[PDB]
Swiss-Prot record, chain B:
Assembly with partners or alone: V-ATPase is a heteromultimeric enzyme composed of a peripheral catalytic V1 complex (components A to H) attached to an integral membrane V0 proton pore complex (components: a, c, c', c'' and d).
Residues of the full protein shown: 13 to 58 of 230
Family the entry assigns: Belongs to the V-ATPase E subunit family.
Function in brief: Subunit of the peripheral V1 complex of vacuolar ATPase essential for assembly or catalytic function. V-ATPase is responsible for acidifying a variety of intracellular compartments in eukaryotic cells.
Stretches of the chain forming a coiled coil according to its record: none
Protein known as: V-type proton ATPase subunit E
Species: Citrus unshiu
Domain of life: Eukaryota
Amino acid sequence: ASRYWVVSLPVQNSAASVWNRLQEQISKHSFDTPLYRFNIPNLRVGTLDSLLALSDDLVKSNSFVESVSHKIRRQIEELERVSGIESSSLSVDGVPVDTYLTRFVWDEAKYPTMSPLREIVDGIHTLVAKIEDDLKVRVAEYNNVRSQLNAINRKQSGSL
Amino acid sequence: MVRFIRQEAEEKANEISVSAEEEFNIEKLQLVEAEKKKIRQEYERK
Amino acid sequence: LAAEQEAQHIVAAARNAKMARLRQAKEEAEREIAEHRAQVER
Amino acid sequence: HDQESLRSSLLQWCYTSYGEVFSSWMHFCAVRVFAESILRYGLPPSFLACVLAPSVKGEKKVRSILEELCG
Amino acid sequence: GEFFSSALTSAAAQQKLGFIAGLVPREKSMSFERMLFRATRGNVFLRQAVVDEPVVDPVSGEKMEKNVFVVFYSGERAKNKILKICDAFGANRYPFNEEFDKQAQAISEVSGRL
């Protein structure tokens, strides 16, 4: 599949024509750039030490996201019958890739707690790990089924 | 920068103090419950 | 600097003054206990 | 036949879990927006970046625009 | 001790923080700014020398352009990476007292011992 491709810029460092022009009316329209975003801040933020800890844990979070992406792109596609879930069917946070990447509404109470995210990030990471574990269980079931496949019928067709 | 760190330190100190005060109130409720129990015991003895 | 003043005695003052809230809780507990004792004695 | 069904029905549940993982990745990107905001700005979460999969030319133009905060 | 009046003023102008006292060679300017962006975050202040004289290594008298510097750490979590950055600098690094007079006295005592 596709790895992470999000840009990095705070509110005070918008690259558009105006500070609020990042969402729309930016020069990216002239260049046909598909960039889109919508603010969704948390209830509160941690201290400087908490910020540094979150930055350190972001590496592990990205590694887990990459592992989940690799599992989803490999196990489903290799079966030649599981890749039928399109972007709308596999919509992120209930919105397709057109709208999922244009907003951060996934920060609601489902994976995080809509609260200081120092531990909410870890909780969401644990939830994603559980989802990836379920996907791995499904992949193991598919492997056992393939073991059931290529059964005694794989031998000769008789008189051999 | 530093002002944001100032707010976080004050907010953490304020929340900790409020939690400590609530815990002290709960401890006081338990203490008055124990005092009422022992007062009932001594009244029954009398 | 400003951060040093923020982490200075400004917060430790409230941390120590939490003992005042604890003392108020103890005082109200004692008052309630004394009132209950007076009522039961009466 | 059971293996084919699992690749079509149980693996349909696997694809649903993949969509859930995509939702989790969207949440991770939302968290990373605030992480970048804290890293290169004040503590409160506030970001004006964007997330997409653009071409090389578009990314180069975005980098040229944002060179005021280059890495 | 020189930073006790320079780095302190820089931090006051830019404003709990850690002490990043130590050293950073004349070639460590890029690593102090281009690198360690996650930890410093641009809100910290630092005072550094240009290695005006060849500073002897902590275990070698051959010396080099090992300028010494003192900075502010953005908390212990960021100080963990700041210590690694200072170790990567590999100059004549040694912590000193916060007070300018005490730091100068420590420098004089170390020079006399040397």
